[PDB]
Design an enzyme around this catalytic site. Structure first.
Site, PDB file in Angstrom:
ATOM      1  N   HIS A  36       0.804  -1.230   0.000  1.00  0.00           N
ATOM      2  CA  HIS A  36       0.000   0.000   0.000  1.00  0.00           C
ATOM      3  C   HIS A  36       0.848   1.297   0.000  1.00  0.00           C
ATOM      4  O   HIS A  36       0.292   2.381  -0.202  1.00  0.00           O
ATOM      5  CB  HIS A  36      -1.085   0.028   1.090  1.00  0.00           C
ATOM      6  CG  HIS A  36      -0.591   0.190   2.496  1.00  0.00           C
ATOM      7  ND1 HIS A  36      -0.213   1.426   2.990  1.00  0.00           N
ATOM      8  CD2 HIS A  36      -0.531  -0.715   3.496  1.00  0.00           C
ATOM      9  CE1 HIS A  36       0.101   1.228   4.263  1.00  0.00           C
ATOM     10  NE2 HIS A  36      -0.055  -0.047   4.608  1.00  0.00           N
TER      11      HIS A  36
ATOM     12  N   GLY B  57       2.460   5.972  10.257  1.00  0.00           N
ATOM     13  CA  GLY B  57       3.882   5.871   9.959  1.00  0.00           C
ATOM     14  C   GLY B  57       4.517   4.567  10.413  1.00  0.00           C
ATOM     15  O   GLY B  57       5.632   4.248   9.987  1.00  0.00           O
TER      16      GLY B  57
ATOM     17  N   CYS C  87       3.550   1.560   9.593  1.00  0.00           N
ATOM     18  CA  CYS C  87       3.400   0.471   8.619  1.00  0.00           C
ATOM     19  C   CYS C  87       4.744  -0.066   8.178  1.00  0.00           C
ATOM     20  O   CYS C  87       5.685   0.695   8.013  1.00  0.00           O
ATOM     21  CB  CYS C  87       2.549   0.897   7.428  1.00  0.00           C
ATOM     22  SG  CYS C  87       0.852   1.347   7.865  1.00  0.00           S
TER      23      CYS C  87
HETATM   24  C1  LIG Z   1      -6.172   7.444  11.737  1.00  0.00           C
HETATM   25  S1  LIG Z   1      -4.626   7.399  10.910  1.00  0.00           S
HETATM   26  O1  LIG Z   1      -3.852   8.537  11.322  1.00  0.00           O
HETATM   27  O2  LIG Z   1      -4.864   7.214   9.506  1.00  0.00           O
HETATM   28  C2  LIG Z   1      -3.838   5.944  11.533  1.00  0.00           C
HETATM   29  C3  LIG Z   1      -3.625   5.809  12.898  1.00  0.00           C
HETATM   30  C4  LIG Z   1      -2.936   4.730  13.375  1.00  0.00           C
HETATM   31  C5  LIG Z   1      -2.438   3.739  12.492  1.00  0.00           C
HETATM   32  C6  LIG Z   1      -1.728   2.596  12.932  1.00  0.00           C
HETATM   33  N1  LIG Z   1      -1.277   1.645  12.129  1.00  0.00           N
HETATM   34  C7  LIG Z   1      -1.508   1.780  10.817  1.00  0.00           C
HETATM   35  C8  LIG Z   1      -2.192   2.845  10.230  1.00  0.00           C
HETATM   36  N2  LIG Z   1      -2.511   2.934   8.860  1.00  0.00           N
HETATM   37  C9  LIG Z   1      -3.631   2.506   8.231  1.00  0.00           C
HETATM   38  O3  LIG Z   1      -4.528   1.887   8.801  1.00  0.00           O
HETATM   39  C10 LIG Z   1      -3.720   2.901   6.755  1.00  0.00           C
HETATM   40  C11 LIG Z   1      -4.452   4.238   6.591  1.00  0.00           C
HETATM   41  C12 LIG Z   1      -5.927   4.051   6.843  1.00  0.00           C
HETATM   42  O4  LIG Z   1      -6.529   3.072   5.969  1.00  0.00           O
HETATM   43  C13 LIG Z   1      -5.793   1.949   5.673  1.00  0.00           C
HETATM   44  C14 LIG Z   1      -6.477   0.950   4.996  1.00  0.00           C
HETATM   45  C15 LIG Z   1      -5.794  -0.164   4.542  1.00  0.00           C
HETATM   46  C16 LIG Z   1      -4.443  -0.270   4.787  1.00  0.00           C
HETATM   47 CL1  LIG Z   1      -3.622  -1.753   4.381  1.00  0.00          CL
HETATM   48  C17 LIG Z   1      -3.748   0.717   5.458  1.00  0.00           C
HETATM   49  C18 LIG Z   1      -4.425   1.838   5.938  1.00  0.00           C
HETATM   50  C19 LIG Z   1      -2.674   3.876  11.096  1.00  0.00           C
HETATM   51  C20 LIG Z   1      -3.391   5.008  10.638  1.00  0.00           C
END
Ligand SMILES: CS(=O)(=O)c1ccc2cncc(NC(=O)[C@@H]3CCOc4ccc(Cl)cc43)c2c1
Ligand SMILES: CS(=O)(=O)c1ccc2cncc(NC(=O)[C@@H]3CCOc4ccc(Cl)cc43)c2c1
Lengths: 305, 300
Positions: B41, B143, B145
């Site tokens: 992604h 960040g 990921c």
């Molecule tokens: C609410 S935020 O600031 O986007 C956030 C907060 C904590 C987070 C903690 N670990 C990961 C985040 N990222 C995500 O989940 C990304 C952005 C959102 O949508 C998706 C949908 C599918 C995928 Cl595979 C990745 C995402 C995080 C994203």
């Protein structure tokens, strides 16, 4: 989101762990520049532990009696001296993996990461706090002596603890890197007991702020309290006094969540007098006191090392 | 003595963390030999959130679009391929700090250490379990990921998880290092929800054995139970079924403490019925389920 007990990355410390063997005793050493630091009780036998004269035991030792092993490479000891309860073995090679470091003595309530080692090899990393009774609730088996506690600030490792012994209650006692024990403990086999412990109040408040940042607000209330009235309640429940220093330190979390420190103190007071009523805070049914205000800010903001 | 949630030393994994930037997105990569692994992604734009066609998006990319940074040194990408939900960026330099490693896919209940990273830099290490609903209760910000989950049982690092996303409940979903998601999750911003989670029963039993090894016995009782009667009771408290595999796995702890598995199961039934009555087990007022039988034997 999420809140976990999180240790500092241990890589900078793993590159310093060595095995120190003296006679029948094998424990861990910390290799920084050309010196290996380890507990002075490595020179003791079973009788020598009962009533030890470390100056007398050390004078009888020669450099070749200390077998230092860094991985599968034997280091050459070229000197030995004692500083309080720590033995310093001068080696002929400076550790190429020596990070930027400092020796710091911490205060009760402060947290640090422990790199538990056996035979100079790191086996686990965990986070813990220096209890108000100067013990740590660690996880250590025989052979773990010399394992160290540390923090990282930017790219500098602050070594704050070295493991020496286990008390009869299963809690642990040790020294700073200058060999000074935390607590009224001595490095000998004699009757010693940890004093009655208390809860680290400022840390509980920091963890309540971390819970609010994570969406857990059920414990919040409309009330506030004076610092003096809160401390009367804290004394009653074996909680450490909350100082104006602690109130000031909690300032940023108070500003971020919109909950004044004395407002959070009134939430803590109600939790102490009434309990959780079957509820949890951050997946815990007890109030957690091993996260400092700096740990909460570090984890909820993502500081890296 | 003592029992702590303990992570593996993270040094072997820290030496593999790199920053991967693609357009406006920056996340973490895992640099092993001459390949950087990261969530695919990273190639997604603001319009490719709901229904990204990763094959189509990737074919439009060139090697110079991927900016890989290992410390203060930019690595040169010389190839790119996709394996399921993971992007593999071939680089012109083999990581000199590559440890002995394996890619292992884990089962629910299994534990692992997470090295949470931001911008290719490690910020913390913590211990997790793969929940029965295939999510992890991590601590991750935007960040994070590409941060990985691993075990280091003797010398070799087994990489079992790579962080991809956070579900609406604040729990986390990711893949093994072959890009296969754990759980019915997809790397799209389409509506996804974690299923109802359950307690990892075999892990609670392992932790009750750890408590007995550490001197706590208040919860023990004179009762035993059939495996079927235990499962009928446990499922009413949203506990996972206990299988004969789990009973067998608990054998060594049962032999060491002298408490048969079904005898410890009867203690667990009693704890579920009564609560703890102001008491704690290993400094916890809840039954802990993120220590496997292997973790308990390792730590004790
Ligand atoms: C609410 S935020 O600031 O986007 C956030 C907060 C904590 C987070 C903690 N670990 C990961 C985040 N990222 C995500 O989940 C990304 C952005 C959102 O949508 C998706 C949908 C599918 C995928 Cl595979 C990745 C995402 C995080 C994203
Ligand atoms: C039960 S055991 O095998 O002695 C053991 C278990 C876990 C242990 C965990 N950390 C440390 C241990 N070692 C000790 O405490 C040594 C053993 C003898 O008693 C003393 C008395 C004073 C000092 Cl300074 C050191 C010791 C441990 C020792």
């Amino acid at each position: 989101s999420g809140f976990r007990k999180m240790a500092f990355p241990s890589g900078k410390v793993e590159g310093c762990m060595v095995q120190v063997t003296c006679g029948t005793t094998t424990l861990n050493g910390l290799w920084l520049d050309d010196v290996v630091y380890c507990p002075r009780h490595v020179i003791c036998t079973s009788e020598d532990m009962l009533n030890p004269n470390y100056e007398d035991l050390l004078i009888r030792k020669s450099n070749h009696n200390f077998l230092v092993q860094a991985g599968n490479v034997q280091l050459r000891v070229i000197g030995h001296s004692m500083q309080n309860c720590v033995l310093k073995l001068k080696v002929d090679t400076a550790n190429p993996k020596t990070p930027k470091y400092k020796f710091v003595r911490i205060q009760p309530g402060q947290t640090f990461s422990v790199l538990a080692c056996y035979n100079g090899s790191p086996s686990g990393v965990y986070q813990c706090a220096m209890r108000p009774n100067f013990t740590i609730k660690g996880s250590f088996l025989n052979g773990s002596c010399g394992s160290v506690g540390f923090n990282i600030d930017y790219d500098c490792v602050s070594f704050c603890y070295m493991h020496h012994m286990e008390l009869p209650t299963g809690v642990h006692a040790g020294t700073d890197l200058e060999g000074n024990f935390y607590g009224p403990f001595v490095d000998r086999q004699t009757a010693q007991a940890a004093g009655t412990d208390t809860t680290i109040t400022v840390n509980v408040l920091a963890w309540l702020y971390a819970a609010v940042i994570n969406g857990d607000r059920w414990f919040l209330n409309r009330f506030t309290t004076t610092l003096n009235d809160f401390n009367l309640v804290a004394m009653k429940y074996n909680y450490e006094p909350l100082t104006q220093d602690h109130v000031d330190i909690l300032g940023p979390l108070s500003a971020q969540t919109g909950i004044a420190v004395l407002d959070m103190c009134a939430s803590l007071k109600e939790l102490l007098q009434n309990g959780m009523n079957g509820r949890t805070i951050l997946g815990s049914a007890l109030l957690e006191d091993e996260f400092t205000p700096f740990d909460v800010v570090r984890q909820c903001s993502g500081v890296t090392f």
